Amino acid sequence: HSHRQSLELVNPGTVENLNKEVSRDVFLSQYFFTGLRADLNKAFSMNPAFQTSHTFSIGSQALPKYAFSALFANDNLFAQGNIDNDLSVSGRLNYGWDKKNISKVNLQISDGQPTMCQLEQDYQASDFSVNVKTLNPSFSEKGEFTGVAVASFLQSVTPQLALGLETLYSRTDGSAPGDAGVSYLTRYVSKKQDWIFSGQLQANGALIASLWRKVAQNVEAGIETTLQPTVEGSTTIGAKYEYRQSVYRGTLDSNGKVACFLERKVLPTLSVLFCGEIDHFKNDTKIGCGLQFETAGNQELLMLQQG
Template sequence: MAAPGLEKEVLTIPVTNPSAPPLDVTKPPSTGTNAIFDTLYDTYSSFLDRRAALGLSNPGTVESIAKEVQRDVFLSAQAFSGLRAELNKSFSLNPIFQVSHAFSTGSQFLSPYTFLALFGTDNVLLQGQVDSDASFSARFNLRPHPRYTFKSSVQIQPSSGMSPGGAQVSLEQDYVGDDFSASLKSINPSILEGGLTGMFIGSYLQAVTPRLALGLEGVWQKPGGEMGPEAALSYAARYKGNDWIASAQLLTQGGLQASYWRRLTDKVETGVDVNLQFAGLSGANAMMGGMRREGTATLGAKYEFSRSIFRAQVDSQGKIGCLLDKVIAPPVRVTFSGEMDHAKNAAKLGLAVSIEASGEELMEQQDRVSPAAPPF
């Protein structure tokens, strides 16, 4: 017999439903939130679901809204004059590491000698260039996240008889979403002159439908000294068809740039670009004689052959140009550039030879290693 006062008390829990699953005490029941937050969260979730159901893709950036015409078809960024020779040497593909030596003569814009070195991985890009005129430029791009890219560049130009010289620093941040792109770029930002100076460019491009994208681009700049700030805003639109792309940018101060790109065949592309300027719409140029209208239209075509690419373009100002890039052998490429300006009665000719001096080890590496894709 147990001693008095030492009896054990047994706690019994009534079981209402023996077939019910056991209670998980590690996950306490969630507490309810306020009705306003729940309504906003449900609305936002419903918006995301409907947005994902549209199947929208990334439309690119406002800066490259007409890249198919201005970069791929036109030869404005590739034309040159004089004689040029390039010797390229690649040491590896992943990471990419290569150097280049370029020699030129008979050109007013190219230096007699230029040295370039490039190193890049899938997330980092380092590039430096120096020439015989003591000009220097460098780029550093970083991709810390698949959606975010940081780009920076530095250019130093010494003074000469044709140029006063100077330096420029550019910082850019790009964010790429599933159906939009946002970018913020600053050129020569500074706070050492009594306030914020420099040029700042912000842009946003949003896909509205699987074919249509709309965007904005704002520019704010303030030079040094007593000059006040200036601002400009432009609207952008891009429509993508099955085999054609149309884009347009409207500047609020008075300007319109429209382009149209079309693929005729698998090897033929064409492009049209129209640039209209309406100076004096805002009243800033009233002392210069009122409103002035200026416009330029450019038509170009690109032909891709088995081992060569031919580009040609003509504009409304009487300028005709062509560029032929031909691979003579796998390590040798020859480029011919020609331009004739009927209005100024001037002509330019250019011939370049590029040699890729890669070793046999790199040729073997191409079969088993995929090249890196740096954030250009």
């Protein structure tokens, strides 16, 4: 265990964030919506993070008519609770026993469906990462595991490459053995951090190949290719401009559809947002407008925000 220290192997990121830059930062699929949306976010404290958010939406079905969320976060705890109409409750609780070990629990209640609980444990070593998440644990009369178990390991062979595997075991009812799936993950980061590449091979032959590039501090791009006999393929290109006044995002798919999403900050509190997707081949177009307004709960932060 001496040449390992001499090589100075760096700790790789989480297995779930191999293509995080492309999936979240670049592409606007996650942040796209339809109809009219208004958000009111009020913050009560800074060093202990604590805030609430009221969401009022109309003109669309994906966004609920009204929603209320409240989150708190101290140095080593995170607790978020959200309530949506028709009595849908979601709660996330993350605790870090140490800088390496993190335990998280997600509990959702639908008031008419069985309560769903997911427990995840993550460990970040000096040069490898191990995560294990369990969904709906159960034991039968034979003492056998029942539920969903996902165990992923990732190790960086060199400070530029990272290889890992993910194993899924899914037993639903317990009468029959669950299915097992193995996925291979590979990640490469350039020396200059200019561009990164990611690849994933699933158990069913599905392929994911993503590339992320950062031209400057205000311009990023990404390209994704997904594949799955009966197989289907998709190619997506996305571009993001991050400016001090506004944020622009555009995306185009190989099927001939395009989408745009802009966030314009005109006031220190109010910030408008527009989004639009057009598919000329299939004749399907969706639109969405929204606004975000921020307030300070206590007088100290109110004065700080006012100036």
